[PDB]
Amino acid sequence: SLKVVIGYLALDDWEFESLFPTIEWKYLTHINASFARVKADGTLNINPVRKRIESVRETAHKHNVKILISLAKNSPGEFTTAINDPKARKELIQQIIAFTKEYKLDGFDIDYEEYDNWDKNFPSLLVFARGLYLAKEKNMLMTCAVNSRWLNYGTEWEQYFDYINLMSYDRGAFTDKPVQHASYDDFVKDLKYWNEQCRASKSKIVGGLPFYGYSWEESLQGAVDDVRGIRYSGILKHLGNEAADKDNIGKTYYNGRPTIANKCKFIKENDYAGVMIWQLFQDAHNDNYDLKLINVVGREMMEEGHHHHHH
């Protein structure tokens, strides 16, 4: 089966202008334009993507990369409210299909993360999934960003998606207490979980990879964001190039090149669909080109090899 590399791209990222011209398209098969936000009434807040979606699509397509619009809650409870209301649900489904057609995208990605009353709300989420699947075009791609092991998705869910992107990161990282938010062991167990418990064929299961981490270091308390999150580019900037080949330095935990490489290796060695990346823009800049994580994924998943013309 064909391997994939699905990269998330935040279209309203502060570093967009500067970094967009550097996207390594040869190492990507799909990109998820980051978030048209779902509103309580089923309508979409497309402010984070409206200004660049068309331009991103033209570029992606020029490099034969598929582009999907990723959807997530506008604010807590809004995505749930939308799917729990019949008319708002039908409106939402029409908006997604319409946005996808209007901007000539290849599909859409569902990133539903309303954890309040998860089990109670799942039947309505399924009703939503079934609907989108029925309303979408046959050729339109339909993917989803999912959690593993800690939340049930049942065994029906899987069949409606071309690719299931496992968010194997942020594990136990929102308290004091430094932790590795994306360990190798958790990555492997998450993959197993979807194949053995959610009964999803390995052929559509894709392992998520983080191009960022967290730091509980006192010296970086202002460099990290809202939740102590820090980009790989930030990690190299403050911790030095030596950080590129480790998953931890002091109280800063992330995924260095060896681990990213090893996760990619596991994917290939066990015939999974491929890998996914949360935020391509978080990667190192060209000042550290050789230490870029996308190049590690590229060397593992999209290695051209030695070839010649006139075969």
Ligand X SMILES: N[C@@H]1[C@@H](O)[C@H](O)[C@@H](CO)O[C@H]1O
Interaction of residue 308 with ligand X, rule CB under 6 A = yes
CB of 310 to ligand X, least distance (A): 8
Binding map of ligand X across residues 249-288, x = CB under 6 A, - = no contact: ----------------------------------------
Binding map of ligand X across residues 7-26, x = CB under 6 A, - = no contact: --------------------
**Are 28 and 297 a contacting pair, CB within 8 Å?**
no
Given candidates 62, 138, 177, 307, which one binds ligand X under the rule CB under 6 A? 307
Interaction of residue 138 with ligand X, rule CB under 6 A = no
Residue the block writes with tokens 């270091």: 217
Q: Which is nearer to ligand X, 222 or 305 (CB)?
A: 305
Interaction of residue 311 with ligand X, rule CB under 6 A = no
Q: Which is nearer to ligand X, 177 or 310 (CB)?
A: 310
Interaction of residue 177 with ligand X, rule CB under 6 A = no
Q: Which is nearer to ligand X, 138 or 309 (CB)?
A: 309
CB of 277 to ligand X, least distance (A): 23
**Considering CB under 6 A, how many residues would be counted as binding ligand X?**
4
For 292, other C-beta atoms within 10 Å of its C-beta total 24
Among positions 285-304, residues that touch ligand X (CB under 6 A) are: 304
CB of 26 to ligand X, least distance (A): 9
Q: Which is nearer to ligand X, 138 or 308 (CB)?
A: 308
CA distance 148 to 254: 19
Interaction of residue 309 with ligand X, rule CB under 6 A = yes
Q: Which is nearer to ligand X, 177 or 309 (CB)?
A: 309
Task: List Cβ neighbours of 238 (8 Å cut-off, separation of 6 or more).
Answer: 220, 223, 230
CB of 6 to ligand X, least distance (A): 23
Q: Which of 166, 168, 167, 171 lies closest to 205 in space, CA to CA?
A: 166
Q: Which is nearer to ligand X, 223 or 302 (CB)?
A: 302
CB of 300 to ligand X, least distance (A): 17
Q: Which of 278, 274, 221, 273 lies closest to 254 in space, CA to CA?
A: 278
CB of 66 to ligand X, least distance (A): 21
Positions that interact with ligand X (CB under 6 A): 304, 307-309
